Design a protein around this ligand. Structure first.
Ligand SMILES: Cc1cc2nc3c(=O)[nH]c(=O)nc-3n(C[C@H](O)[C@H](O)[C@H](O)COP(=O)(O)OP(=O)(O)OC[C@H]3O[C@@H](n4cnc5c(N)ncnc54)[C@H](O)[C@@H]3O)c2cc1C
Ligand SMILES: Cc1cc2nc3c(=O)[nH]c(=O)nc-3n(C[C@H](O)[C@H](O)[C@H](O)COP(=O)(O)O)c2cc1C
Ligand SMILES: Cc1cc2nc3c(=O)[nH]c(=O)nc-3n(C[C@H](O)[C@H](O)[C@H](O)CO)c2cc1C
Ligand code: FES
Ligand code: FES
Ligand SMILES: [Ca+2]
Lengths: 206, 412, 408, 198, 251, 446
């Protein structure tokens, strides 16, 4: 069955962030809470899948001169719809996500997949590729968010897991897990572990 | 016979031996006790006598006066605060409830106001020694782990990192926090880059920054700089930021902090930073020996003086830090410690004579800038050094490019 | 309702305005004019193309193939060309085939070179003499178990101009072949049925091209002959299809029509007084025979020469009569052969073992100055590696080791 | 006058676009191998940002913001499409102008424009401009300062990576992992300006 | 290809995308407005001492229990307008609706004050039981906003909640701690002479004091911010005149 | 005058007395194959062959037309070869006095000779190998020229001989060699010397330049850096004073002149002094009955840069004018690294030794520590006088960044130009081989 390979390879074999360098801004920004990481993962998956589907649908008619304009028009329309829906039904998470909902348009994963696969493949394959890349992105986002939120606030999805001294518990949260360097360090160590368990991705020495 | 024993048990650690996996530790001990006894193979058949062992041991010895005075001062401050707060039965109960205090008393010391220098130094030791031991053991674990896994040889440099980290923390730091800080500093900043001589950040300050930003409540405020139970008291730089020079008063004794007190080290703060005189005495030896960079020190002094005098000339109506002169900037906080022993790390600094001046000037400017125009933090030496570590390579690049142009002009 | 209309109108107007502005800018800024590329400064053989595309396709527009092979990923590196005008800087991936020294004379890979303006070119080796030929198969016999001797005729009394050790390019159309159609004799069928190699088949629906060595010296007029090895799938994953061109060639027979093209070569011999040593294995017999015949029959050179061939058994050796005739007619050449597996029917008494070990133990170890000899080598890569290591441990320099590795 | 100098210093040091807001990280990480390449890319970023932010400010103030065109009508939901289209068209037009009229400026910086035709740094800069409601001069100064800060950060990273030629990184950390760790340490160092109330 | 085809394709794509986007954007605006209002309404209900779960209950209780009103800071008396839709935060930035403060007056470091503010009266039938005052001031890292509930004598605090701040979670973020917020109930804003008297005591306030609350441990620079906020907003330039009118039975 | 301030004069014991005396009888000589950069020999002799003086022994594959000839008449007894059959030395046993002779000219005709005739005579006599080329320190191609030929009439290596004492015996030969070089060159001839006087050539393009200061004030690399900076497109030739005397003798008498004056000195030498020897003389026979008992190392050349003279390599080098002998430092000390060394030398001031000015040390071959990474405490700047960045250049060499090293100035350096940097390294790196590897890469890549 070919579908499983397409949906699963970008998770570990060709991870968009750990092997390719794409979508690092949102990974660094929106991983201080697991709910925001989850919502961003879903939004990116949805936008990438539909952009791939439509671009592959009209791949034979795009004029070469303004292909970028056409692709970005489609992507921006999808992102605008997503942003409106989020503000209509998930107002709190939309507030927390800040400008990074609109930055899905410039997220490198969407444009990279649209150019590389959608322009050369059929609609259903392009949609499945988008879903797979979304899952690969979500893997890193959720893994980073789990550690950051747990070790920084004793919570997961806002649920209390580690009682805090301020509430009469036993755990003192780490303040650095709520700041920028923690995401960098966590992503670096995740890449280290991934390339230890799958050494074929190790880079050659310069 | 130590030599006979060492050269007898050697076969156990060679390949195929009973203890082959501990060869790194065995050789470390062997070359600590005796010298390698090797000879030259090529090029220069004669070599200089200096080596990393001496380079590191001299720096380690340079901080002994500061360490001892820091212990003495911590004990004196703690005793003074305790006698200011409590008396009689309350003081007895407080002493009975703290292992530092009742251990000091058990070993022959006294916690009363008439305590001597011996008792004060003992009380300071019961705070300093546990921190240093924890730091050393925890960091050595990681060093040995990396050396074993990557089949390297344990080298010197952590011998200095551990003590420098231990001397720049408050006397009341928790031991688990100290362990976390040393782990971060050793692993994230140095080991992943290949070890000693292959990193770019300062390992000691990297861990201190980790503590600073992860657990700010235990490394800042009025509750951490004097090891007296229940005592709350501000320090010199905070008091200046609040009310100028007139605000410098020691609440434990009701006396006015003077420039001589700040210079000698009769003030609260980090364990080993307080004594500018002791730090100068220590740094003079290593500057004379050629291990520390007088260019870096001069650059730091130049930047500090220039920016402090510019702020003094500009003046301010609501910020009391604008009128702190250079000679007051010199003796407060960790400026002297950082300038003498942490801004001179050879690996983290610029590798060019011209770049060293810029590096020092940048450190000096940033320290005063953070002290004055940043209200969040009363001090900025650690942050300034960590900041200049990022830009030293660019100074090197500029100097190298000018040299390369000179060469292309057939004048080099 | 009003807001929806306003949004539609504004969206359409903004997008259309941006598109129109960029289109106008492109029409007024990009050249759009034709440009000319000239070769060797001549007013002839020049080409005019649109301001874009690769240099290789512009050259192919005039039939100049620049000895291209595999056409992708810079796999071959044969597409180098020298540029004499103010061209662009080399792409980073040309350094894998072009050295820093070569980069200073204008050497560039035609595959990676893009064009948007006039430029001047200099073609090495005067490849304008290339020709395409229509040929009639003479023989496709099995001289061994996995290599087939192909012989082609040249029409109108012509003869391909080439140097000994050169190679030719073979072009084939779309085809479909099955290994069961091969005419392998019984003496060699014993292994094909042992491994059930008749299971395989291959096909392709667009024409393909390949390069193959030439097994006759220049004055053997009137015929082109080759030795072709059957390309079977790798043994670790034998489920993949076999090779294309070799399988196609193995299906031919006497009287069949075929086309050859692209006679080139870079494996030529040096003209010195030094001794020559030839090491061959498997398919490599062709260039070795070419060099030996060219040196002995045409030039009649008096340099000392020797040939060492590694085999499996007696049923895998060929050109025995030719090499014996050479060694008997002139004493400046000596032929030695070693086979790994002497079967009982072979009645073998000669050298055994691997060819590198045989050569080292019998000839080179006692040689007065092995570094002064010239070594010409062709054959399987895992034999070439061992031979190279053995020669290197004797102090032989790369300048005296000439290698022709089939397939790179 | 002090207002604009404060804005410039804020944009360069205090609110650093790269290390403080995490924008443009894909390119900031990929193109940090050589100092001169990073310098050219940063110059291109400076130019594109300082040209883009003011134009988007003009468009937003004249069309998109509420009651800008007609009373009771607001078209702020077109912000994303308008900004991205403007940036994309303008970058290509400038690249093309440099290619035709200025071959040397093209070789210098124009070769980097394709990377930044669609970039998180520029888009987030415009987005922050929209939220902060800058004037035209404020937009110009903010764009210039953000570009300069991004150039400073990327050039510092390039210098550190060049210094790292002597390092011995574990095989699993070579490249992406060690560069991520270095960037995290750079952010740790840059947190010195956090509390400045400029 | 031809510009004719290019323009046709782009025009059709733009039409489709614009129709979709505009319809989606214009169809959800009312729900977005409701979502925005609900957040503020929940905080006002909380500080008012009213418990509510769900949007339906929040709206139902807010509509009947809370009566927003506009107040003129200069004269401390009510003004006419749509209080339920007034935006004091942007009103403060408009030059035609706000005043520039003086260095001596700007104790809280807000740099501007709107001409008219909004207060939320709490109703028990027709009678009024409490008035909720929005206040804000600069902390160490961010601008801190809070609601303070004051009874009808104009002196006694019923509750306090900070609903927007950006201080460090450990040191300065404790303004949101329920235990610290509970200390404010029962305290008196003014002394017997009607001068501001709220004091943030460093090191802890004495037990039984009617004007002192414990300062934030290790977070003086934020306690100073709170003290400045209250010193400014209880003075002449804040709700001073309004609170004296309330004391005089104006409600 | 040019004055060098950054440098170091090694205070090693055993300074020779600058008086010349007859040396021990030599019965064997050899030519060392590994001391010529990039040389690949082609043998013209075999064991047992008899040879005449100046008869060819082998040629160079990588440098066509260059001939290496015998220094003495005798019989070939050994052809030593190492790993991968690399030639180590060709040993000749002295017997007889047969020689190959060449054309001879009057002293006043040497300045007007033809460049091609001079080159032909030098190549045929084999004296053409005295020259070396910067960059790459290789024997120049016989078809190339250079605008600058650098003559080294000074020596600052520790325990080295005084060139004035040797030159004062061969003034006419030295002047004739200078005239021949002036005729051979296309630009100028630079005679680098100290403040004292030497015989002068009257040709207008021969110039004397005085250098003052410690080591490396006497190195051809420093002289080139200060008088004629070299690069890929600017190549200079280097030759020492004794080879100039040999050239003068060749063009004056038509005979190859193979006499030498070398310094035999070191901590373990009983009577340090200058001794008359022959090119390629056997050092084991030279130092017989001259050394104190014990395990010692015999070095051909200076202790800063030289070749361990053991077994097949136990012969005087082509470019070496001294022999150094010192003990092998295999002792182990109890906490030796922590002692207050009064007898320990160092360019830093961490030992008590520097407090005793004028002290001399009985230095050995021990390495005072183990190998470590580079911690730049600034020792290289104290010893590097050239306009370079020592720390960055050395780190580029360690990392193997050939392009960066070339940009920083590796093309101007020889192995002996980094001897002090190797000496004073706390990490115990050996930068000479790193520089040679970088130069090999650069030359190989064309
Ligand atoms: C100058 C020159 C001279 C040469 N001379 C000769 C010569 O004289 N004789 C000679 O025999 N060769 C020669 N070669 C080699 C020849 O050009 C090819 O390397 C090959 O031998 C041609 O065989 P083919 O066209 O039948 O099969 P190809 O299709 O060229 O070979 C493809 C191979 O890859 C395998 N393969 C295909 N798909 C996959 C897959 N998905 N996964 C794994 N494996 C796969 C196939 O089974 C087969 O083994 C020469 C090459 C050069 C450059
Ligand atoms: C080397 C060194 C660096 C320091 N760096 C900082 C710093 O960056 N920020 C800070 O708040 N305190 C820093 N400190 C701590 C202060 O110097 C001081 O000990 C502490 O803040 C006590 O308050 P005071 O500075 O008002 O005396 C450092 C101390 C040392 C020894
Ligand atoms: C003069 C000198 C100063 C040093 N200062 C420090 C320091 O401040 N912090 C530290 O961790 N190591 C210090 N070291 C040890 C070592 O140089 C440092 O850990 C390197 O960065 C390790 O590569 C110092 C060493 C010397 C010789
Ligand atoms: S730059 Fe790639 S996602 Fe932002
Ligand atoms: S196909 Fe030959 S180099 Fe590209
Ligand atoms: Ca207001």
């Amino acid at each position: 069955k070919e579908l499983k390979k397409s949906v699963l390879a970008p998770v570990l074999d060709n991870n968009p962030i750990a092997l390719q360098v794409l979508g690092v801004c949102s990974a660094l920004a929106v991983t201080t809470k697991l709910e925001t990481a989850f919502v961003m993962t879903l939004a990116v998956m949805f936008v990438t899948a539909l952009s791939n589907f439509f671009v592959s649908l009209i791949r034979n008619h795009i004029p070469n001169s303004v292909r970028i304009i056409v692709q970005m028009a489609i992507i921006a329309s999808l992102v605008i719809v997503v942003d409106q829906i989020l503000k209509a039904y998930l107002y709190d998470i939309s507030k927390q996500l800040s400008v990074f909902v609109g930055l899905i348009i410039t997220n490198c994963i969407v444009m990279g997949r649209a150019e590389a696969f959608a322009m050369k493949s059929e609609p259903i394959p392009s949609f499945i590729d988008g879903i797979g890349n979304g899952l690969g992105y979500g893997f890193v986002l959720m893994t980073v968010g789990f550690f950051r939120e747990l070790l920084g606030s004793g919570k997961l999805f806002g649920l209390e897991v580690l009682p805090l001294i301020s509430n009469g518990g036993w755990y003192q949260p780490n303040g650095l897990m709520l700041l920028a360097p923690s995401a960098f360090f966590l992503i670096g160590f995740m890449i280290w572990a991934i390339r230890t368990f799958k050494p074929e991705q190790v880079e050659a020495k310069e | 016979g130590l030599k006979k024993f060492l050269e007898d048990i050697e076969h156990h650690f060679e390949p195929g031996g009973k203890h082959e996996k501990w060869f790194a530790l065995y050789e470390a001990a062997a070359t600590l006790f005796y010298t390698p006894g090797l000879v030259t193979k090529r090029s220069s058949h004669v070599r200089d006598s200096v080596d990393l062992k001496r380079i590191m041991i001299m720096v380690w010895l340079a901080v002994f006066p500061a360490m001892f005075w820091g212990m003495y001062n911590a004990g004196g401050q703690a005793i003074a605060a305790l006698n200011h707060l409590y008396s009689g039965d309350q003081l007895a109960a407080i002493v009975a409830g703290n292992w530092h205090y009742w251990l000091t008393e058990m070993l022959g010391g006294t916690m009363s106001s008439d305590a001597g220098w011996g008792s004060k130094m003992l009380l300071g030791a019961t705070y300093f020694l546990p921190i240093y031991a924890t730091v050393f053991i925890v960091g050595a674990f990681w060093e040995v782990l990396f050396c074993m896994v990557r089949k390297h040889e344990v080298n010197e440099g952590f011998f200095v990192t551990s003590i420098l980290f231990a001397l720049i923390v408050p006397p009341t730091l928790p031991l688990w926090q100290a362990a976390l800080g040393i782990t971060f500093g050793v692993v994230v900043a140095k080991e992943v880059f290949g070890g000693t001589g292959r990193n770019f950040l300062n390992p000691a300050l990297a861990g201190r920054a980790f503590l600073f930003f992860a657990y700010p409540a235990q490394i800042s405020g009025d509750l951490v700089w004097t090891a007296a139970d229940g005592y709350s008291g501000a320090t010199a730089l905070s008091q200046w930021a609040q009310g100028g020079a007139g605000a410098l008063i020691n609440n434990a004794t009701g006396q006015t902090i003077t420039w001589m007190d700040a210079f000698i080290g009769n003030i609260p703060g980090s364990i080993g930073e307080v004594s500018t005189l002791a730090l100068m005495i220590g740094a003079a030896f290593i500057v004379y020996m050629g291990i520390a960079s007088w260019r870096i020190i001069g650059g730091v002094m130049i930047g500090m003086i220039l920016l402090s005098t510019l702020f003094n000339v500009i003046g301010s109506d609501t910020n009391a830090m604008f009128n702190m002169p250079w000679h007051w900037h010199l003796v407060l906080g960790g400026f002297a410690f950082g300038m003498f022993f942490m801004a001179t790390d050879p690996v983290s600094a610029s590798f060019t004579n011209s770049g060293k001046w810029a590096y020092g000037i940048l450190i000096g400017v940033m320290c005063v800038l953070i002290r004055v125009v940043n209200p969040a933090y009363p001090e900025g030496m650690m942050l300034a050094i960590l900041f200049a570590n990022l830009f030293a390579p660019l100074f090197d690049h500029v100097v190298v490019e000018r040299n390369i142009k000179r060469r292309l002009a057939r004048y080099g | 309702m009003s807001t929806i209309i306003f949004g539609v109108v504004m969206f359409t107007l903004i997008i259309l305005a941006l598109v129109l502005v960029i289109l106008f800018a492109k029409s007024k800024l990009v050249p759009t004019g034709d440009i000319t590329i000239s070769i060797n400064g001549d007013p002839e053989k020049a080409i005019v193309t649109q301001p874009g595309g690769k240099l290789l396709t512009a050259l192919a527009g005039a039939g100049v193939f620049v000895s291209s092979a595999c056409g992708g990923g810079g796999s071959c590196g044969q597409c180098r060309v020298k540029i004499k005008s103010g061209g662009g800087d080399i792409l980073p991936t040309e350094l894998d085939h072009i050295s820093k020294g070569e980069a200073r004379e204008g050497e560039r890979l035609a595959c990676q070179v893009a064009v948007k303006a006039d430029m001047d070119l200099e073609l090495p080796e005067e490849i304008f003499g290339v020709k395409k030929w229509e040929c009639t198969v003479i023989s496709n016999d099995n001289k061994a178990t996995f290599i087939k001797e192909l012989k082609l005729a040249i029409p109108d009394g012509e003869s391909v101009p080439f140097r000994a050790g050169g190679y030719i390019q073979i072009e084939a159309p779309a085809h479909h072949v099955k290994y069961a159609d091969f005419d392998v004799p019984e003496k060699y069928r014993g292994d094909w049925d042992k491994f059930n190699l008749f299971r395989y088949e291959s096909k392709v629906d667009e024409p393909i091209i390949r390069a193959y060595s030439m097994a006759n010296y220049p004055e053997e007029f009137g015929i082109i002959m080759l030795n072709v090895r059957i390309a079977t799938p790798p043994p670790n994953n034998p489920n993949v299809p076999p090779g294309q061109m070799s399988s196609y060639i193995w299906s031919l027979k006497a009287g069949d029509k075929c086309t050859i093209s692209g006679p080139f070569g870079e494996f030529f011999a040096k003209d010195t007084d030094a001794e020559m040593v030839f090491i061959g294995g498997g398919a490599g017999m062709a260039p070795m025979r070419s060099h030996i015949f060219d040196q002995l029959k045409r030039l009649k050179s008096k340099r000392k020469m020797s040939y060492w061939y590694g085999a499996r058994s007696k049923r895998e050796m060929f050109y025995v009569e030719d090499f014996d005739g050479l060694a008997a007619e002139n004493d400046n050449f000596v032929w030695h052969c070693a086979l790994s597996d002497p079967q009982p029917e072979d009645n073998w008494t000669g050298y055994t073992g691997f060819i590198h070990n045989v050569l080292y133990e019998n000839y080179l170890k006692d040689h007065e100055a092995p570094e002064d000899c010239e070594y010409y080598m062709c054959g399987p890569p895992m034999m070439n590696a061992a031979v190279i290591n053995m020669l290197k441990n004797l102090g032989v320099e790369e300048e005296n080791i000439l290698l022709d590795d089939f397939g790179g | 006058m002090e207002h604009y100098i404060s804005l410039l210093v804020k944009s360069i040091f205090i609110e650093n676009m790269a290390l403080s807001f995490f924008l443009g990280m894909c390119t900031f990480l990929a193109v940090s191998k050589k100092v001169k390449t990073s310098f050219g890319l940063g110059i291109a970023v400076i130019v594109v940002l300082t040209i883009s932010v003011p134009v988007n400010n003009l468009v937003y103030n004249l069309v998109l913001k509420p009651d800008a065109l007609v009373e009771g009508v607001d078209l702020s939901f077109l912000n994303f499409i308008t900004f991205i289209g403007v940036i994309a068209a303008l970058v290509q037009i400038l690249e093309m102008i440099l290619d035709r009229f200025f071959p040397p400026l093209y070789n210098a910086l124009g070769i980097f424009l394709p990377l930044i035709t669609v970039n998180c740094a520029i888009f987030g800069g415009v987005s922050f401009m929209v939220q902060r409601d800058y004037s035209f001069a404020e937009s110009v100064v903010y764009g210039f300062g953000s570009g300069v800060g991004w150039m400073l950060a990327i050039v510092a990273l390039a210098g550190i990576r060049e210094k790292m030629k002597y390092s011995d990184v574990p095989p699993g950390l070579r490249g992406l992992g060690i560069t991520f760790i270095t960037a995290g340490l750079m952010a740790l160092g840059f947190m010195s300006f956090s509390g400045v109330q400029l | 290809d031809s510009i004719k085809k290019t323009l046709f394709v782009v025009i059709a794509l733009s039409l489709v995308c614009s129709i979709i986007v505009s319809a989606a954007a214009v169809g959800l605006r009312d729900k977005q407005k409701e979502n925005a209002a609900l957040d503020k309404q929940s905080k006002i209900l909380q500080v008012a001492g009213i418990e509510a779960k769900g949007s339906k209950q929040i709206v139902e209780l807010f509509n009947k229990s809370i009566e927003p009103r506009l107040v003129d800071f200069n004269t401390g008396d009510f003004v006419e307008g749509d209080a339920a839709n007034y935006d004091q935060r942007k009103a403060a930035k408009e030059a035609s609706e706000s005043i520039k403060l003086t260095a001596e007056q700007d104790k809280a470091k807000i740099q501007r004050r709107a001409n008219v503010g909004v207060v939320y009266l709490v109703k028990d039938g027709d009678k009024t039981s409490k008035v909720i005052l929005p206040v804000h001031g600069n902390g160490l890292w961010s601008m801190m906003y809070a609601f303070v509930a004051v009874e009808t004598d104009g002196n006694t605090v019923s509750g306090l909640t900070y609903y927007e701040q950006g201080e460090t979670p450990g040191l300065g973020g404790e303004v949101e701690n329920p235990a610290w917020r509970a200390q404010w109930v029962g305290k008196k804003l003014f002394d017997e002479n009607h001068k501001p008297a709220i004091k943030i005591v460093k090191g802890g306030a004495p037990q039984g004091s009617e004007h002192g609350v414990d300062g934030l441990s290790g977070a003086t620079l934020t306690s100073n911010g709170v003290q400045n906020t209250f010193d400014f907003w209880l003075g002449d330039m804040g709700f001073g005149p309004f609170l004296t009118k309330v004391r005089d039975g104006g409600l | 005058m040019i004055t060098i301030k950054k440098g170091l004069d090694l205070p090693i014991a055993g300074t020779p007395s600058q008086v010349i005396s007859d040396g021990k009888a030599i019965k064997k000589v050899a030519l060392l194959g590994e001391e010529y950069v990039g040389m690949r020999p082609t043998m013209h002799v075999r064991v047992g062959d008899e040879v005449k003086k100046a008869q060819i022994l082998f040629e160079d594959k990588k440098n066509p037309g260059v001939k290496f000839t015998s220094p003495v008449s005798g019989k070939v007894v050994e052809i030593n070869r190492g790993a991968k059959r690399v030639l180590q030395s060709v040993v000749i046993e002295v017997a007889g006095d047969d020689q190959v002779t060449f054309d001879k000219f009057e002293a006043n005709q040497l300045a007007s000779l033809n460049r091609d005739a001079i080159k032909t005579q030098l190549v045929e006599s084999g004296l053409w190998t005295a020259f070396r080329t910067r960059p790459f320190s290789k024997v120049p191609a016989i078809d190339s020229t250079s605008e600058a030929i650098f003559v080294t009439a000074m020596d600052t290596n520790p325990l080295a001989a005084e060139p004035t004492v040797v030159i004062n015996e061969q003034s006419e030969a030295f002047v004739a060699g200078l005239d021949v070089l002036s005729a051979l060159t296309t630009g100028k001839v630079y005679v680098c010397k100290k403040g004292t006087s030497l015989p002068r050539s009257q040709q207008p393009n021969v110039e004397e330049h005085v250098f003052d200061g410690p080591h490396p004030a006497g190195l051809a690399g420093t002289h080139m850096h200060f008088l004629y900076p070299v690069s890929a497109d600017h190549v200079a030739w280097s030759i020492n004073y004794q080879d100039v005397i040999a050239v003068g003798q060749l063009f004056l008498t038509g005979e190859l002149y193979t006499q030498r004056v070398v310094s035999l000195a070191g901590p373990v030498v009983n009577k340090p002094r200058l001794v008359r020897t022959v090119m390629g003389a056997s050092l084991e026979q030279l130092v017989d009955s001259e050394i104190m008992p014990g395990e010692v190392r015999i070095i051909s050349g200076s202790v800063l840069s030289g070749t361990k003279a053991t077994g097949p390599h136990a012969y005087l080098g082509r470019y070496h004018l001294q022999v150094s002998v010192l003990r092998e430092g295999r002792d182990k000390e109890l906490f030796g690294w922590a002692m207050p060394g009064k007898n320990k030398f160092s360019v830093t001031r961490s030992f008590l030794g520097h407090l005793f000015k004028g002290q001399v040390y009985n230095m050995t071959t021990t390495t005072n520590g183990s190998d470590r990474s580079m911690v730049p405490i600034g020792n290289y700047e104290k010893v590097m006088p050239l306009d370079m960045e020592p720390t960055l250049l050395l780190r580029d060499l360690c990392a193997g960044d050939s392009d960066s090293a070339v940009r920083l100035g590796a093309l101007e350096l020889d192995e002996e130009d980094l001897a002090l940097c190797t000496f004073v390294c706390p990490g115990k790196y050996e930068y000479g081989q790193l520089l040679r590897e970088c130069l090999d890469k650069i030359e190989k890549e064309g």
